Amino acid sequence: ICLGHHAVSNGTKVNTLTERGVEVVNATETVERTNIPRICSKGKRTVDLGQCGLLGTITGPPQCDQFLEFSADLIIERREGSDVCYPGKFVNEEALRQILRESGGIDKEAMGFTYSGIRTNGATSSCRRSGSSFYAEMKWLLSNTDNAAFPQMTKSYKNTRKSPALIVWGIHHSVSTAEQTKLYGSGNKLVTVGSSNYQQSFVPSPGARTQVNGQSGRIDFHWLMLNPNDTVTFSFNGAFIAPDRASFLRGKSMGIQSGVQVDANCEGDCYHSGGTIISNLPFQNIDSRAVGKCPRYVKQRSLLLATGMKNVPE
Amino acid sequence: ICLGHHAVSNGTKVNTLTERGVEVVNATETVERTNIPRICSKGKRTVDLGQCGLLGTITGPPQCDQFLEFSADLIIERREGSDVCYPGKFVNEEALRQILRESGGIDKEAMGFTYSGIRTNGATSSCRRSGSSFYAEMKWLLSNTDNAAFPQMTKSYKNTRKSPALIVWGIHHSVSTAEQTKLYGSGNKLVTVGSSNYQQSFVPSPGARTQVNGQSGRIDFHWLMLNPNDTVTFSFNGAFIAPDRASFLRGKSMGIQSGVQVDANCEGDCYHSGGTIISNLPFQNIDSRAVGKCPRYVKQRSLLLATGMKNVPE
Amino acid sequence: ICLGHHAVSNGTKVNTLTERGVEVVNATETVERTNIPRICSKGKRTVDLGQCGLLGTITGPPQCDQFLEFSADLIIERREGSDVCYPGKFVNEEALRQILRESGGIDKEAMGFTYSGIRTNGATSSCRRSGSSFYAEMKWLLSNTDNAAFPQMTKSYKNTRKSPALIVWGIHHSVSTAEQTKLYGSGNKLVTVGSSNYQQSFVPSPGARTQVNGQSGRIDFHWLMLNPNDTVTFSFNGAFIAPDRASFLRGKSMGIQSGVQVDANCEGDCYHSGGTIISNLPFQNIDSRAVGKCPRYVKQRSLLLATGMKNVPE
Amino acid sequence: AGFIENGWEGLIDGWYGFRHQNAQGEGTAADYKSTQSAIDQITGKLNRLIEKTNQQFELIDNEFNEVEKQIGNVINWTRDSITEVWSYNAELLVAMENQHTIDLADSEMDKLYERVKRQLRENAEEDGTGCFEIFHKCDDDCMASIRNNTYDHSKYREEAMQN
Amino acid sequence: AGFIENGWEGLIDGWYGFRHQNAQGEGTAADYKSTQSAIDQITGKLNRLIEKTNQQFELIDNEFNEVEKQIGNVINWTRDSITEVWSYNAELLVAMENQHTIDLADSEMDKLYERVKRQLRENAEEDGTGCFEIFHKCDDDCMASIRNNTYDHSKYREEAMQN
Amino acid sequence: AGFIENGWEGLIDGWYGFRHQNAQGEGTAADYKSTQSAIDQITGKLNRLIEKTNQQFELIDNEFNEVEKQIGNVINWTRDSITEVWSYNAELLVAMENQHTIDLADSEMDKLYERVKRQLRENAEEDGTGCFEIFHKCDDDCMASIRNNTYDHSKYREEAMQN
Ligand SMILES: *[C@@H]1O[C@H](CO)[C@@H](O)[C@H](O)[C@H]1NC(C)=O
Ligand SMILES: *[C@@H]1O[C@H](CO)[C@@H](O)[C@H](O)[C@H]1NC(C)=O
Ligand SMILES: *[C@@H]1O[C@H](CO)[C@@H](O)[C@H](O)[C@H]1NC(C)=O
Ligand SMILES: *[C@@H]1O[C@H](CO)[C@@H](O)[C@H](O)[C@H]1NC(C)=O
Ligand SMILES: *[C@@H]1O[C@H](CO)[C@@H](O)[C@H](O)[C@H]1NC(C)=O
Ligand SMILES: *[C@@H]1O[C@H](CO)[C@@H](O)[C@H](O)[C@H]1NC(C)=O
Ligand SMILES: *[C@@H]1O[C@H](CO)[C@@H](O)[C@H](O)[C@H]1NC(C)=O
Ligand SMILES: *[C@@H]1O[C@H](CO)[C@@H](O)[C@H](O)[C@H]1NC(C)=O
Ligand SMILES: *[C@@H]1O[C@H](CO)[C@@H](O)[C@H](O)[C@H]1NC(C)=O
């Protein structure tokens, strides 16, 4: 009696320690290349920011009015999103973005700042609602009379809760020094911000800039995080965008950037800007910057694991 | 004659490439989980800073008077440690901390600054010794008469040694502009610091802050490292905390943060905040932030290496 | 008939999973230790900067006059290279260096700034050519009469090309406030720079510094990158080093730092400061900071791979 | 898969099998125990390598608004290093697993052969290429007694011994 | 550990041993050479894997005063990546070493068996389950001659050949 | 390389060979097939491990003008971590490859031996240390018939059987 092994006419080539191109009976893939060109959001609380920039949800330009108190397990940034209506920028913007992505949403709370002896309803043609408006969560602090002085004012807020609060203020950089003296009066203007982990103070830098959104003045957006039972102090005297409400982190989530469509039909934990990687394989060759619970990215496009024996045909 | 292998009634399950749960005769552990809840400092020169913050050893608040010229192979930071007596903060504090942790101690040397036409014995109720004192290694530079002017002063120090020197100065941020004009006189105050690798200049930002340690004024602490045969120049005119002595690194050491007790009975090279990892195994599952000469941290709590054969019982 | 294997008198010891020091017939090396003490530049476009610092190629001190529009596949920095002629420093210098190393060279283009009512031919004894000169690509903006005022001036430049432009300006920090009022007139001087991704404004910090290259005044060098079809705006009024021409990246290259000699006889892709690593082995033990297409650095100096069988001699 | 010079492409019944030719016709029937052993081992490899790491990685870059150049080049540097590491790990892992798989199948074939050899003690003799030359004519039911490991090691002994 | 259907739980004397039953009673005595070979190999594995890296890593984070958020997230990102790498390395290393250990012991058992088989050339015959059927009654001292590799391959030859 | 107690240092002709002594003198000639198999396998290992990664890494530090201390310590931290990883990978890789190489050569020797054993079926008998005791005097041309795998398994059979 004889005894042997099986074989096939068309085998599958793999690589080993010894050879490169050994023909085996059956093989399987270890590097995922298939992509789902959608953000698989089945079972998750998704917030698609759209034209609203992430940081904008803290300041509140018009395009973010429907995102001032969101709650999510998955936060999607969009390329068309804008953080500002009046031309400005955020100092340490990417750090605050990475904070807000895994925050699980935000929760506003009024800080309770009352002002005696100044005006408090600044607006502009860019931040537009019914007419000329402004950032929802902010207040443009000006002087009473077209052209007066600004009284050296001091405000303060204590975090009365158990999680760190998010404090965001602004510094106005007017188009000229004559316009700065028009809005806030002449003389040097100093903005001091202090707490238990914070020093700092700031002052403006008026001058002409590029016309963005119609205006040439800018607004610096600064932020800190108040620890529980810690107080924050603002000693200002002009060119000040005061915070109305502070922000509190809801819980935990994950932030992604993508340009594909949301889909509640498929489930996924590994996301990139092109879609979702739905796979059980240990490796992937689609995006090295994929976030979530992903297979490890490798440079190789294919690595075949042998599931059968050596194929020796007649 | 027959011949076979040995076996046991109670084997030990391990994992292989092929199976998961193979019963073998004997096995050993490869992931260390046992911890010693003490800082094993046998044979090492240890300096437990206690209530003295690390950076404080350069400035010299009261709680650091016994640490102005320490020498260590192991430096322990404590949570109760405070870097300041008068409320203030260090710019680039973590970098200076990481410098001082592996310095092996510090060595002070007088910089030799003599002042003609000003006062030089500032004090406060917070930095307390016999009465109202100040930072040991620092000098609060004020104006002669309650309320005068500050003469535009210029000082300089050359590093006459073979290792880089540590230069630390301060900028006073008074509670108000009236208090700043009281201490240093009216007018703009500019603090310029220059060398071969350094530009910079600074000026104060007076205003009200949170009452920390009783006071509302702050002090910025800045620092640079003078190269050998390089000179440092200070062009100042008010709101200046001048350095009395410069610091020099002694040698090499390691800095840890911990809340457990020192112990000279056990020897250890791998430390974390919970104690010491005394092990010869290649892996550990205790703290991913452990420092020193440690086994590599892994997520798994147990990985059993087979030291015996396959266990096939009757 | 008998049958056996071969052997040798002098074998080669290797390590295995089981033993340490097994004698085998033949073995080969896997860790490269041989170095070529030259920068093998065969077939590559090399630019040896020599006494010209990399960043200097953007500003144009005398020692960089022959490097204002270079083109390279390999850029070599030298220790004797100097980025400045007048004492100054670059803000975010290392980032700009890493940008310029892989730029493949630079391409200048005049920005077209015309000035009406000021002087524009500043010079100094340090930046020396025929007599007292200045940075080639820069213009020292002063006031007309020894001692006048500076008119609040505003200039702007739009990037009319398809790649980001490199914009570099300067801020003069004079030796004193009397010299600053001499050059640019009294009063506060504010330098504002704005675009679509940029805010900022700056002002000077006069005062005495260390005498470097003969002078005590400094110059801050700042830079940004204009996106295509984006405009940059400068609102200044004194202490200004204006840019004459902007820079554009040519393509792709690699930057190294070395002190060995260029050699067009050998070919290499892995470079370090000591020479070139010409090897096919997967590992190396020469320099952990080697750049290019290198074998992976390992701590071990030798790891012998067995190429023969077990050596069992008589 | 060594000196068994080729495989039987018609054996679509299993991995290993017996093919005999005595006097009562032809035979080709697969063996279940060895085939199932190899299948369970390869299955173990597959179930171990297919794995979902519960480790979640967050964003660190920014695709829409590029971060500062220095920290960006440090991030890119680290990501490329980790990519090199995982590429190496994947390559070596796949190659090693393939080697052990092939040698595993060869080992199982050798075990089948050696067992069938020891099951008939002096009743048959070895030839050269993985067959057993019978020196007593063994009918089909006797071949089936060889297959399910019930062939007797002495009840046909001297009959084939004298031959 | 293959067709030797089970192990001898009473053999607390070593890893491998001989258990015989002839006419002068019973026997069970361990073998020293093979057992010592396997013990030395496993010992080599243990001494190689137990290793202290002379590489020292310093602090980069701060447990008491959290560092800036951006650099902190880059640090956490890198540390988690390296943790993934070392977890993978530990898992694969342990699994591979266990496989080679088990197959190593099986190999040593097979070597012992094959040597004892070749030591007696035609004096005894193979049975099926790791025993050797003697065709000449071999007393206890002859079994001990088999154990210490001194049994003669011809001085009992035709006596057992005729049987 | 197991019970073949030592190697033949004079066999500078190949890896494996036949050395015979019958009546017509002495013989020592290498075997080409097995030697070439092992040589091709080791060659495969070498060609696979010698590899140039097309991945290019740029500078991130600065040797002439030291970067900021914090980012510098993060960079040094990461570089040292990756150095640890690659040191481990190199060590384990080399050790594993060496093990599989040695065991590979031993396997090839065993295959050569087993094939030569099965080529002569009952014409010769086993001795103990990798030799074959002939029971019919086989001249030099018959030894060469054994070498190139042409020795007949029956045309010398009963002549050596009666002995
Ligand atoms: C071959 O491998 C694939 C892997 O996906 C598996 O689905 C398939 O059932 C296998 N087929 C055979 C005949 O082994
Ligand atoms: C915060 O302050 C409130 C005020 O009474 C106190 O009840 C609470 O215990 C404090 N919590 C902490 C964590 O300090
Ligand atoms: C089993 O392994 C442990 C590992 O620590 C060792 O201490 C012990 O001596 C071993 N015992 C036996 C019987 O192998
Ligand atoms: C530093 O300056 C002193 C002054 O004479 C000189 O002797 C010494 O060689 C210098 N060392 C270096 C490293 O420049
Ligand atoms: C031994 O290995 C080296 C590796 O470089 C090779 O060049 C040489 O030809 C080999 N020699 C023998 C006899 O195997
Ligand atoms: C840039 O502006 C020019 C001006 O007409 C236009 O032709 C070109 O399409 C623009 N390109 C981009 C990318 O905006
Ligand atoms: C990092 O790599 C990406 C490509 O994955 C590239 O787009 C980006 O510009 C790189 N970062 C920097 C700072 O150049
Ligand atoms: C990094 O991880 C630690 C936990 O190990 C966490 O406490 C810390 O907050 C993280 N860093 C940041 C910036 O969130
Ligand atoms: C990083 O390591 C190098 C040695 O490779 C050392 O020269 C350098 O000083 C280190 N970096 C810092 C910030 O100390």
Domains and CATH numbers, chain A: 1-44+261-314 (2.10.77.10), 45-260 (3.90.209.20)
The alpha carbon of C68 and the centre of ligand 7 are apart by a number of angstroms equal to 26
Distance from CA of E12 to the nearest CA of F (A): 27
B16, B19, B301: which to substitute to probe chain D, counting the most D Cβ within 10 Å?
B19
Q: Which domain holds residue F55?
A: 1-163
The SS3 call for residue B263 is strand
**Count of structural domains, chain E:** 1
| Domain at E69, CATH number | 3.90.20.10
Task: Report chain F's C-alpha Rg in angstroms.
Answer: 27
Question: D73, C95: Cβ pair inside 8 Å?
Answer: yes
Query: Ligand 5 within 6 A of C309 CB?
Result: no
Q: How many CA atoms lie within 13 A of B261 on its CB side?
A: 4
Cα separation of B70 and B119, whole Å?
Answer: 31
The one-letter code for the residue type at F38 is A
Can you read off the two tokens belonging to residue F152? 């007949």
DSSP A227: P
- CA angle at residue C155 from C153 to C159, to 5 degrees? 170
Q: What is the dihedral of CA D7, D10, D15, D16, to 10 degrees?
A: -70
Q: Is the dihedral of CA F65, F70, F71, F72 positive or negative?
A: positive
Closest by Cβ to A218, choosing from C156, C199, C231: C199
* CB contacts < 8 A (A, F): 16
Pair B23, B304: CB distance under 8 Å: no
Closest by Cβ to A209, choosing from C202, C230, C233: C233
Q: Does D90 touch chain A (CB under 8 A)?
A: yes
Cα–Cα separations (whole angstroms), residue F57 to C54, C195, C255, C258: 20, 33, 11, 16
Ligand lying nearest the CA atom of residue C164: 6
Pair C34, C303: CB distance under 8 Å: no
Q: Tokens 């004020």 correspond to what residue?
A: B142
Q: Tokens 């400061």 correspond to what residue?
A: C273
The one-letter code for the residue type at C97 is R
> Which residue has the least CA distance to atom 2 on ligand 4?
B229
Angle at which helices B93-101 and F69-119 cross, to 10°? 60
Straight-line distance from the first to the last Cα atom of chain C, in angstroms, rounded to the nearest whole number: 20
Cα separation of B292 and B308, whole Å?
Answer: 33
Helices (H), chain F: 32-49, 69-119, 140-147, 157-161
- Consecutive H or E run containing A58: helix A56-59
Question: C296, D84: Cβ pair inside 8 Å?
Answer: yes
Closest by Cβ to C2, choosing from F15, F98, F131: F131
Paired strand residues for B82 = B52
The one-letter code for the residue type at C225 is M
Task: List binding-site positions of B for Ca(2+).
Answer: 69, 107-108
| Interfacial residues of A (vs E; Cβ cutoff 8 Å) | 92, 94-96, 98-99, 197, 296
Cα separation of D156 and D139, whole Å?
Answer: 12
- Consecutive H or E run containing C144: none
Instruction: Collect all residues of chain C within an 8 Å Cβ-Cβ radius of residue D70.
Output: 92, 94-95, 98
Q: Does D137 touch chain B (CB under 8 A)?
A: no
Question: D58, E81: Cβ pair inside 8 Å?
Answer: no
Pocket of ligand 1 from Cβ distances under 6 Å: A 26, 28, 307-308
Pair C208, B235: CB distance under 8 Å: yes
Cα separation of B87 and C301, whole Å?
Answer: 53
Question: Is A230 labeled as ligand-binding?
Answer: no
Paired strand residues for C284 = C32, C297
Kindly tell me the number of DSSP H helices and DSSP E strands found in chain C. Answer: 3, 27
Pair C156, C231: CB distance under 8 Å: yes
Pair D44, B19: CB distance under 8 Å: yes
Instruction: Collect all residues of chain E within an 8 Å Cβ-Cβ radius of residue C19.
Output: 41, 44
Q: Is the dihedral of CA C49, C51, C52, C53 positive or negative?
A: positive
Question: Is A137 labeled as ligand-binding?
Answer: no
Pair B167, B158: CB distance under 8 Å: no
C-alpha closest to that of B127 among B83, B161, B192 = B83
Pair A109, A126: CB distance under 8 Å: no
Q: Does B307 touch chain C (CB under 8 A)?
A: no
Can you read off the two tokens belonging to residue B302? 């147990």
DSSP sequence for C278-299:
---SSEE-S-TT-EES-PEE-S
Pair D124, D132: CB distance under 8 Å: yes
Beta strands at F16-21 and E132-134: parallel, antiparallel or unpaired: unpaired
> Which residue has the least CA distance to atom 1 on ligand 9?
F76
Q: Does D48 touch chain B (CB under 8 A)?
A: yes
Helices (H), chain E: 32-49, 69-119, 140-147, 157-161
* CB contacts < 8 A (A, C): 43
Best of A162, A229, A230, A231 for a ligand 2 pocket test (most atoms within 8 Å of beta carbon): A229
Pair D134, D22: CB distance under 8 Å: yes
Ligand lying nearest the CA atom of residue E62: 8
Query: Ligand 5 within 6 A of C307 CB?
Result: yes
Cα separation of A1 and D147, whole Å?
Answer: 10
Subunits close to E (at least 3 CB pairs below 8 A): A, B, C, D, F
